[PDB]
């Protein structure tokens, strides 16, 4: 579970759509 | 590893000084475990708890065993040797360990370590990136390298947002510096104070007379001079460490490391848009400047929106390949090759590499510049500008001046229209859709269409309250004036008299509520459209015999409830589009005009069709769709040129068999009627097919299966 | 790792000597820590605190305990043994550490470590670059050329970065100076104090109250060993001195802040390599000391001649001869064209191909044509657009015997070539670009007087006024076309001198009046006034004086009616009057029956008039887009018509005699109102389906035998 969490969180951290949704929010 | 860039010369100096100090600590420690002792000799004569110090010489006989001597050594070493001499190497080791922990606390503390590793990684990988050299040199770029460049730009932006919020790294470095300097002060104070207590000769008085026989002994500490020079060397090293620490503190406090000005890099390069980075980001960039200004110089190119704009344009040139543009090519209503560019960052250069393209469609393109590579676009004739603020290169401006012939401009703001459209000379078709009427910009912006000379089609969907004086100046050569106000009445004021060369006039959705006299003053018109002008009465058409050339009177989408008989004077009409009106009866005088070819009276209030329709032999497409016509007269089939009988949505009870005499019929619409059954003679039309014969399936089933086979074969063959 | 290039022989020697000195330092330190002791025996007979040195023998009974002996040893080792004999290995260790710190402060100081690492990376990248081999040879892949250009730019940026200041040279000089003075002090004090390491020591410490004896004689067992560890060490320092001294001489015999590439720029062809200076010069001198080949093959990245060679080689690999034949096209003159657009440089393979006839150079900057343009055989056209052409004297002389036609596209004076005036053997020339600038009214075209064989000059330069220089130049002119694109042309009767003109084109001159100078030239066969916005042609009465005009061109105008007098021009053979405002064309106008070509499309003709029957020596009539309903006997008295431009009309029918017109190249029917094609059109198998343009629904009404014959003749 720790490896799955860190893999998901790291791949989310380099996801462009995270920045896209942050721009949409703010 | 890669943290060396974040360690300036002071940090390296303290790192090496701490290493040498730890070597001193280890050496002193192993000597203290190994050969630290005190050779003690008793004083034979004592006087008030002190040694008296009062024929050949002979040695003094103490009568002590070797083990009594060892006991005396251990007791006096424990009791009367100063604590500094005993615990100097361990104190030095503790001090050096604390110094190393202070120098390496920010590397291990997760809150600062995450920021530090992010900074080091993205800064190093920006430093070895090739697009940094490409931008600082100011082509073609590899796909993988382009993906790396865009990912690095996004990572730099997200890290800049992530780091600038707080100043945890600056505060931690500050606190480490004050802790190190105050510990240096304490170390130097106590070590200098207690360094003189390391003595070779120690007088001990330990009260072990019951076990040995003597009370006071004079011991020699052998590792006292060696420990003294080791302590002096340690004091000198701590002095150097402390001086470096106060230099670091002065460097931190003299300037403001929380504020970086990029004025050196931004003025050197063409990028004047690099922001003044602040806070923690500014702090580690100052640290990198203490290492090497080149890293900051090559990193600053990733903080400017000009650089990312150029990168986006180059990447868009790269991704939009030629073959995908070939499969993107389409055709318009004018049978010209077409390419719709919708919602792109810029315009691809591979679009401009095309040669077969005729109409390029620029829709929602924010602030792009037209490259001169338009010299390749020789077949380009129609530039379609939708909400696109376009800047123009001079050779491309000349090329469009000598090639481009049709420009459509839609804009939301009157500043969005390019100012180089007036310099165009080969332009004939202009479509200015969007409000030209604004305060002090009401037709003053388009006052430069006087520079336009060959303009013949001027579409204006622009909510014009009154028609411009500039089109009164231009309309000597204008041949079509399509004005859409979407609900604003024109005060024409008979100003079209100077506009004599019009062949078509399309006043659509103008809410005129009456036909003005400017159309009547003109003479060259052949296609008159008055769509959605709310024309309640059209009684003026008696004067339309003055217009000897009119051939298409598109009086549709209006409030026309009747037709005056003077339309019989209009023998020159070929297409009379009266559909979607309120006309309830056709006068027979309208049926005098033998030249009518497209009699579209659909969506109206007609209840009957006069028989005189048989006189209209040139009629081809009679569309009476959605009317109240119950029975078609046989004389309707007298006209043998009916090509498309749109009888749909009517109340036709039965279609007579005389339709079998018609030959030009290609598509007849009967679905939605009261038609009981389809007669057999409907199959007698040769050119009619299933696509042409649109009808309900059960109505199709009424035809004979041999006639149905003929029609199904016309669908097949 | 990769720093071994920056360590010359002296640095390696000093590093090895420092390692050996550290070895003997730790050896002496281990000895001094572990078995350094002093065996002190009391002198039983003494004289004034000095050792007097005065039946089997018996041992001297000193009556001393073992611990009294240990105390005597400790006191006379601390008090009387010399400090050098006790702390020699620690001094050697400290000196060796100082020497190592001085040697490695070059690599450990960040300010110079960054520059050293950058220089190492750049030098190794240039060392492993394949293009250097080609640079030392006198084909490369796309990746090879791209990385060569990128590393060229990196070398230029590094040269800008490092040459500005000398921090590496200053630190190296300071390190050498410090090492030299440290060697001097070390040799001085070690030689002075090496004579105190003695085996025998007379100690007198005054511990008589604790031992009973005043003076003792002590043996220091390690002393002799320390002697062979001291003098040896001295010898090492001497070497470490002399080598360092040599290094100092190497930093003073010449200015290391001025590297000269004279040997390389003399041996190699590149003579443009600059004399680099400062830190760049110092590290290049160090690399020369290591290996001259690194500097030799790095010197080719400091010259712009090698940069130009790489650029031309890269563009040569881009555009091979096969891709040139791929890009080969043909123009309107049926000549071989090669559209070269947006290239950083001109190729050489494009001049290798002798087939080329029209060398096209559109918007190609930094153009410098080598004499390999002499390789071109059919070169008679040079379509240079927005091109600044530089041509050497042999290639210019080659142009002086083969070049014939030359088109220039320019933005005022910026893109106008200067070598065109010396060209005296060309025959055609074109110009395009605004010339009527402020204070420069037609002053830039004053150098076209040496051109004597020029015959064709065409201009499109939006002239507000007629240039007097043009009138002076045009003496030897045959064809001249003037395009003003919506600007007034003030001829002002100045064309009377232009007697040699045989074709005068005035496209979009917006004249609205025919200038009176046209009526003076008896050589003009073609008069072109297209898009002049002519409404009333009342100047054709004055055209009666001319007897040379064979074709008037008043098309794309608004001529409401053509007057009667124009029917007096028998020499007219081609009437281009299409897209005009002509309502009824008079029959008297068709008294001239030798109207071979005719353009009357897009007009307002309501019927084809009578004296078309008079016409006999024609080949086409353009009746597209007017109000004519039928092919009358008037068009049917013509027996030489070949193309009918009758499309998008209200033409009701084709009567029978058009089915006798077997020599019918084309018909145009793009929207005409024909009932059906008559069976008389089946009388002519000469007209094929590709030959005529007929609507698909109109074409299918022909009989199946006729349609099969039409498709057959399309195949046949
Ligand atoms: C605070 C952290 C410190 C870390 C400590 C590391 C481990 C310490 C434990 C040591 C493990 C085993 C070693 C014990 C050996 C004890 C033998 C002993 O005490 O015997 C007494 C007797 C007394 O010696 P004297 O000849 O009087 O010497 C007086 C000097 N003029 O000693 C002996 O007989 C032999 C001593 C054995 C020495 C062992 C240690 C030597 C260490 C080598 C030092 C390395 C020097 C490095 C460079 C020096 C500078 C150039
Ligand atoms: C700045 C902070 C300063 C810290 C220094 C504290 C000094 C306080 C002095 C206390 C004092 O004087 O009391 C005496 C007392 C000694 O008492 P006696 O021997 O009975 O008296 C001798 C007669 N003079 O002194 C002390 O306690 C000195 C304290 C020494 C502590 C030094 C730390 C030693 C800790 C050992 C751990 C290190 C191990 C390293 C691991 C090695 C791994 C390779
Ligand atoms: C001329 C320039 C001279 C350069 C040398 C500097 C010191 C000179 C000292 C002159 C002097 O008077 O010294 C006396 C003075 C007192 O001597 P005693 O033994 O009490 O009396 C001697 C009996 N005659 O002697 C000294 O202090 C010796 C000074 C030399 C210090 C030795 C070197 C210092 C550095 C030690 C390095 C430590 C590293 C340990 C790490 C080991 C590796 C794991």
């Amino acid at each position: 579970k720790i490896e799955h969490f860190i893999s998901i969180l790291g791949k989310c951290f380099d996801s462009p759509w995270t920045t896209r949704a942050l721009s949409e929010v703010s | 590893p890669a943290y060396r860039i974040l360690k300036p010369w002071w940090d390296v100096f303290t790192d090496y000084i701490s290493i040498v100090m730890l070597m001193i600590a280890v050496f002193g420690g192993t000597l203290q475990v190994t050969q630290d002792k005190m050779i003690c000799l008793p004083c034979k004569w004592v006087t008030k708890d002190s040694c008296n110090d009062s024929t050949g010489p002979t040695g003094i006989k103490y009568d002590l065993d070797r083990h009594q001597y060892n006991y005396v050594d251990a007791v006096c070493y424990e009791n009367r040797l100063h604590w500094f001499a005993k615990y100097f190497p361990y104190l030095v080791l503790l001090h050096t360990l604390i110094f190393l922990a202070c120098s390496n606390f920010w590397f291990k503390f997760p809150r600062t370590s995450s920021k530090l590793e992010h900074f080091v990684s993205i800064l190093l990988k920006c430093f070895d990136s090739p697009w940094t050299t490409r931008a600082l040199s100011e082509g073609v770029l590899d796909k993988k390298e382009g993906e790396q460049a865009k990912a690095l730009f996004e990572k730099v932006k997200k890290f800049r947002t992530h780091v600038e919020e707080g100043d945890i790294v600056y505060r931690l470095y500050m606190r480490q510096t004050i802790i190190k300097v105050i510990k240096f002060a304490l170390i130097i104070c106590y070590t200098v104070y207690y360094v003189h207590n390391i003595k070779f000769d120690v007088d001990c008085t330990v009260d072990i007379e019951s076990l040995t026989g003597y009370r006071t002994y004079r011991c020699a500490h052998p590792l006292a001079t060696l420990f003294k020079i080791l302590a002096s060397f340690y004091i000198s090293l701590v002095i150097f460490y402390g001086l470096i620490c106060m230099y670091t503190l002065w460097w931190m406090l003299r300037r403001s490391l929380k504020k970086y000005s990029f004025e050196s890099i931004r003025e050197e390069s063409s990028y004047s848009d690099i922001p003044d980075v602040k806070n923690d980001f500014a702090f580690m960039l100052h640290l990198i400047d203490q290492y090497d200004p080149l890293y900051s110089k090559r990193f600053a190119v990733f903080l400017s929106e000009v650089s990312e704009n150029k990168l986006r344009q180059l990447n868009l040139n790269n991704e939009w390949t030629l073959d995908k543009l070939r499969q993107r090519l389409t055709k318009n209503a004018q049978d010209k090759l077409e390419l719709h560019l919708f919602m792109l960052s810029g315009i691809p250069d591979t679009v401009f590499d095309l040669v077969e393209l005729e109409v390029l469609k620029l829709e929602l393109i924010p602030d792009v510049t037209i490259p001169p590579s338009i010299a390749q676009l020789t077949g380009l004739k129609e530039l379609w500008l939708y909400h696109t603020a376009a800047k123009i290169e001079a050779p491309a401006l000349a090329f469009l001046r000598e090639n481009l012939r049709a420009l459509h401009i839609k804009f939301t703001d009157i500043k969005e229209i390019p100012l180089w459209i007036y310099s165009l000379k080969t332009l004939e078709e202009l479509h200015l859709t969007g409000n030209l009427s604004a305060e002090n910009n009401r037709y003053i912006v388009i006052d430069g269409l006087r520079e336009l000379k060959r303009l013949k089609v001027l579409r204006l969907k622009s909510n014009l309250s009154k028609l411009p004086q500039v089109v009164t100046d231009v309309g000597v050569h204008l041949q079509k004036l399509s004005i859409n106000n979407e609900g604003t009445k024109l005060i024409v004021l008979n100003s079209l008299k100077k506009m004599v060369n019009l062949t078509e006039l399309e006043l659509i959705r103008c809410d005129l509520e009456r036909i003005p006299h400017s159309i009547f003053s003109l003479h060259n018109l052949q296609e008159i459209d008055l769509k959605d002008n709310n024309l309640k009465t059209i009684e003026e058409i008696i004067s339309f015999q003055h217009l000897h050339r009119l051939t298409c009177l598109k009086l549709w989408y209006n409030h026309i409830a009747y037709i005056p008989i003077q339309i019989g004077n209009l023998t020159n009409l070929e297409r009379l589009y009266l559909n979607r009106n309120k006309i309830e009866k056709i006068p027979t005088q309208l049926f005098y005009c033998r030249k009518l070819r497209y009699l579209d009276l659909s969506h109206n209030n007609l209840t009957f069709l006069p028989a005189d329709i048989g006189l209209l032999q040139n009629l081809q497409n009679l569309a009476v769709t959605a009317n109240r016509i119950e029975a078609l007269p046989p004389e309707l089939f007298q006209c043998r040129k009916l090509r498309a009988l749109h009888l749909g949505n009517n109340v036709l009870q039965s279609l007579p068999s005389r339709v079998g005499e018609l030959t030009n019929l290609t598509q007849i619409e009967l679905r939605g009627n009261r038609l009981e059954c389809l007669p057999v003679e409907l199959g007698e039309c040769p050119l009619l097919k299933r696509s042409g014969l649109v009808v309900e399936e059960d109505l199709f089933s009424t035809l004979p299966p041999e006639v149905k086979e003929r029609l199904w074969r016309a669908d097949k063959e």
Side-chain angles (χ1 to χ4, degrees), chain A, chain B:
Chain A
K1 313 189 198 36
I2 278 175
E3 286 145 0
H4 206 313
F5 187 55
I6 192 45
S7 177
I8 277 275
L9 198 36
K11 165 202 281 193
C12 286
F13 191 67
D14 307 51
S15 179
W17 191 107
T18 40
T19 79
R20 280 217 40 85
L22 260 290
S23 58
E24 173 285 340
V25 164
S26 302
Chain B
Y3 274 148
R4 147 222 62 198
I5 50 144
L6 276 188
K7 283 163 103 60
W9 68 265
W10 42 76
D11 278 10
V12 175
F13 279 19
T14 73
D15 187 31
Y16 273 122
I17 284 180
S18 288
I19 280 311
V20 152
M21 261 195 298
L22 199 71
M23 151 195 288
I24 282 184
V26 166
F27 180 71
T30 172
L31 265 56
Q32 211 256 14
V33 201
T34 316
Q35 307 139 219
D36 207 22
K37 51 184 178 180
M38 288 221 312
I39 295 120
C40 297
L41 274 197
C43 281
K44 255 271 184 176
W45 280 268
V46 296
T47 300
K48 309 300 174 300
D49 261 348
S50 173
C51 304
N52 195 209
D53 199 357
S54 62
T55 183
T58 326
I60 309 294
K61 278 202 172 309
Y62 292 126
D63 292 332
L64 287 193
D65 280 37
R66 184 188 178 271
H67 223 68
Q68 310 193 49
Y69 275 129
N70 293 1
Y71 186 89
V72 165
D73 297 346
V75 170
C76 290
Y77 176 84
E78 159 78 32
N79 283 47
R80 294 294 181 275
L81 186 47
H82 194 246
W83 61 269
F84 191 71
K86 299 157 61 185
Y87 305 121
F88 156 80
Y90 315 113
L91 278 161
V92 166
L93 201 152
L94 161 86
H95 288 335
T96 56
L97 284 203
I98 274 155
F99 270 151
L100 279 174
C102 289
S103 266
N104 291 354
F105 180 65
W106 68 328
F107 289 155
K108 305 304 175 178
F109 187 49
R111 188 179 174 187
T112 42
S113 179
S114 78
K115 296 193 173 184
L116 259 60
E117 52 196 0
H118 261 297
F119 184 66
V120 156
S121 177
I122 88 177
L123 162 79
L124 224 35
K125 154 176 49 156
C126 173
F127 184 79
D128 59 75
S129 90
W131 150 255
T132 36
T133 313
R134 178 159 177 85
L136 288 169
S137 43
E138 318 298 322
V140 284
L141 281 198
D142 185 37
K143 195 91 197 68
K144 308 299 182 178
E145 177 253 21
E147 303 317 298
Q148 292 156 233
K150 59 180 55 52
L152 207 30
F153 263 81
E154 201 66 340
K155 279 154 47 54
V156 160
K157 194 43 62 203
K158 78 175 46 172
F159 165 109
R160 186 202 167 188
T161 57
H162 154 38
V163 164
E164 239 168 302
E165 44 196 22
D167 55 341
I168 179 59
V169 177
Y170 178 78
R171 282 181 330 162
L172 211 65
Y173 210 70
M174 181 86 108
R175 287 165 192 172
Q176 288 171 181
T177 305
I178 315 112
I179 287 172
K180 268 155 67 192
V181 70
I182 65 161
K183 187 155 196 34
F184 142 76
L186 261 51
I187 282 168
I188 220 67
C189 283
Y190 100 95
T191 321
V192 164
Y193 186 42
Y194 288 122
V195 78
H196 79 276
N197 286 15
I198 312 184
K199 288 184 315 304
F200 177 77
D201 273 298
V202 179
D203 299 33
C204 68
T205 311
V206 278
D207 301 318
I208 46 177
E209 193 190 357
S210 54
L211 296 151
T212 286
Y214 313 96
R215 277 200 53 237
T216 81
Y217 316 81
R218 176 90 171 182
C219 307
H221 193 224
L223 298 179
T225 319
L226 195 140
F227 276 179
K228 206 131 59 192
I229 52 188
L230 274 185
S232 299
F233 195 20
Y234 171 72
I235 284 159
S236 171
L237 289 179
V238 168
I239 274 178
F240 291 161
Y241 199 108
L243 289 187
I244 290 164
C245 283
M246 334 195 92
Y247 179 75
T248 308
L249 198 60
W250 170 82
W251 166 75
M252 224 165 293
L253 301 203
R254 160 192 49 111
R255 58 217 296 192
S256 186
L257 297 185
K258 289 185 290 187
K259 292 168 10 210
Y260 206 173
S261 187
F262 268 118
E263 91 286 4
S264 303
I265 298 85
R266 132 168 48 87
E267 291 226 42
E268 187 267 341
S269 299
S270 176
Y271 321 117
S272 298
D273 50 330
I274 292 177
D276 295 63
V277 177
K278 60 171 182 299
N279 270 20
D280 250 351
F281 206 177
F283 169 66
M284 305 141 279
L285 280 176
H286 269 126
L287 280 184
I288 272 296
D289 278 2
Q290 303 304 330
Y291 181 77
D292 200 11
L294 192 60
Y295 286 77
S296 169
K297 205 181 137 283
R298 294 192 182 180
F299 187 87
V301 86
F302 278 17
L303 287 172
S304 51
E305 84 294 334
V306 162
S307 181
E308 75 205 29
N309 284 345
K310 306 213 211 291
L311 179 57
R312 275 198 328 270
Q313 217 287 323
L314 228 57
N315 256 322
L316 216 73
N317 295 345
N318 201 10
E319 46 213 290
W320 260 117
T321 71
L322 273 193
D323 296 354
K324 168 193 32 174
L325 290 167
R326 301 293 180 83
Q327 77 101 17
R328 195 37 199 76
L329 279 165
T330 44
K331 298 191 70 178
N332 62 347
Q334 309 185 28
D335 303 346
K336 302 178 173 183
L337 218 54
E338 221 175 24
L339 212 49
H340 194 273
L341 300 184
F342 181 80
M343 182 175 288
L344 293 186
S345 61
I347 60 167
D349 221 44
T350 41
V351 170
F352 265 68
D353 199 19
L354 201 41
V355 48
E356 44 258 21
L357 173 58
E358 313 183 47
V359 181
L360 93 168
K361 325 172 72 73
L362 289 189
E363 186 152 345
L364 281 174
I365 289 303
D367 202 288
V368 86
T369 64
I370 299 184
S373 56
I374 211 158
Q376 264 77 4
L377 277 170
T378 88
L380 171 141
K381 323 279 262 173
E382 309 204 345
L383 168 87
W384 257 17
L385 289 196
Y386 285 123
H387 295 133
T388 294
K391 282 85 190 170
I392 171 55
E393 210 71 34
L397 180 53
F399 185 87
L400 288 192
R401 168 171 313 109
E402 295 143 345
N403 195 1
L404 160 47
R405 70 192 306 210
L407 171 43
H408 292 216
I409 318 183
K410 179 154 48 55
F411 52 85
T412 47
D413 188 17
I414 211 152
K415 312 173 198 61
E416 291 181 6
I417 172 176
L419 300 184
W420 60 270
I421 70 136
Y422 317 118
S423 62
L424 289 183
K425 312 282 184 273
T426 44
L427 211 72
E428 313 99 4
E429 301 78 37
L430 200 66
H431 287 61
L432 295 170
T433 82
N435 184 29
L436 330 178
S437 302
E439 178 195 356
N440 301 344
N441 287 320
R442 197 185 173 185
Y443 320 133
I444 316 297
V445 179
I446 66 156
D447 263 341
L449 320 168
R450 304 296 308 275
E451 194 178 350
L452 269 283
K453 192 59 189 179
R454 214 186 274 99
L455 211 68
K456 305 158 195 182
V457 174
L458 193 44
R459 200 262 189 285
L460 302 168
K461 175 172 51 143
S462 298
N463 309 268
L464 311 173
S465 298
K466 191 197 297 291
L467 79 84
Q469 76 287 346
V470 80
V471 280
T472 71
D473 305 345
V474 168
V476 183
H477 29 284
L478 265 173
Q479 294 188 341
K480 178 188 161 187
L481 196 67
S482 182
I483 310 190
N484 192 351
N485 284 347
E486 304 120 299
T488 311
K489 183 177 175 55
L490 285 315
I491 308 100
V492 189
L493 228 57
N494 288 359
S495 52
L496 301 191
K497 303 200 57 49
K498 332 291 166 186
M499 174 179 230
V500 282
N501 208 7
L502 294 175
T503 63
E504 176 141 44
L505 178 71
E506 308 177 5
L507 296 185
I508 77 161
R509 293 187 52 183
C510 315
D511 202 3
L512 295 186
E513 297 117 351
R514 92 166 291 281
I515 300 180
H517 307 95
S518 67
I519 330 169
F520 265 146
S521 304
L522 195 37
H523 275 268
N524 268 339
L525 279 182
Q526 55 176 343
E527 275 83 67
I528 302 156
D529 191 358
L530 301 181
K531 159 181 183 351
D532 211 0
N533 286 354
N534 296 3
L535 261 165
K536 318 170 191 307
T537 60
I538 49 155
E539 275 282 345
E540 303 98 319
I541 58 174
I542 171 181
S543 296
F544 258 128
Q545 205 274 336
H546 297 207
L547 255 74
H548 293 285
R549 291 285 186 273
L550 89 177
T551 50
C552 187
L553 200 55
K554 280 184 179 182
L555 307 180
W556 56 354
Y557 274 129
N558 298 320
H559 312 336
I560 313 176
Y562 72 73
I563 309 300
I565 87 161
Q566 37 266 52
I567 194 78
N569 314 353
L570 280 190
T571 60
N572 312 301
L573 305 175
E574 298 186 7
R575 310 147 60 96
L576 170 89
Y577 274 120
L578 303 174
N579 48 300
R580 291 272 175 89
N581 289 345
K582 316 174 179 300
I583 327 163
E584 53 183 0
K585 52 171 172 60
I586 297 184
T588 62
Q589 293 87 11
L590 182 137
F591 261 17
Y592 291 165
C593 180
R594 282 200 69 263
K595 294 191 194 176
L596 287 177
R597 199 177 193 179
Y598 224 121
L599 189 68
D600 202 327
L601 261 289
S602 298
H603 280 116
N604 274 249
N605 313 346
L606 284 310
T607 324
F608 85 111
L609 216 169
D612 181 302
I613 190 70
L615 177 63
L616 313 185
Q617 287 299 315
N618 282 350
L619 170 60
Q620 287 200 341
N621 293 21
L622 175 91
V624 289
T625 310
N627 266 327
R628 215 179 170 182
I629 305 170
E630 286 184 352
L632 298 192
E635 301 218 353
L636 186 31
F637 313 104
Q638 278 171 355
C639 160
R640 294 299 200 270
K641 288 192 183 181
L642 300 150
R643 189 188 63 182
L645 268 163
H646 283 206
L647 269 296
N649 210 262
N650 211 329
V651 284
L652 184 47
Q653 308 162 355
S654 181
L655 174 130
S657 65
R658 285 200 49 179
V659 86
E661 307 156 350
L662 309 180
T663 315
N664 288 349
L665 184 32
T666 57
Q667 42 179 120
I668 191 165
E669 304 181 344
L670 302 167
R671 164 201 295 182
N673 287 70
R674 312 306 298 108
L675 190 37
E676 301 181 6
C677 62
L678 253 67
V680 185
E681 281 77 21
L682 207 169
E684 297 190 358
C685 313
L687 261 203
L688 255 178
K689 45 184 180 175
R690 153 79 202 209
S691 323
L693 176 49
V694 48
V695 83
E696 310 173 2
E697 301 325 329
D698 60 333
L699 288 181
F700 216 163
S701 78
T702 67
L703 286 144
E706 212 81 336
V707 173
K708 263 201 304 185
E709 260 318 310
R710 171 68 180 180
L711 293 163
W712 280 332
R713 210 148 55 95
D715 196 13
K716 298 155 204 302
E717 86 204 353

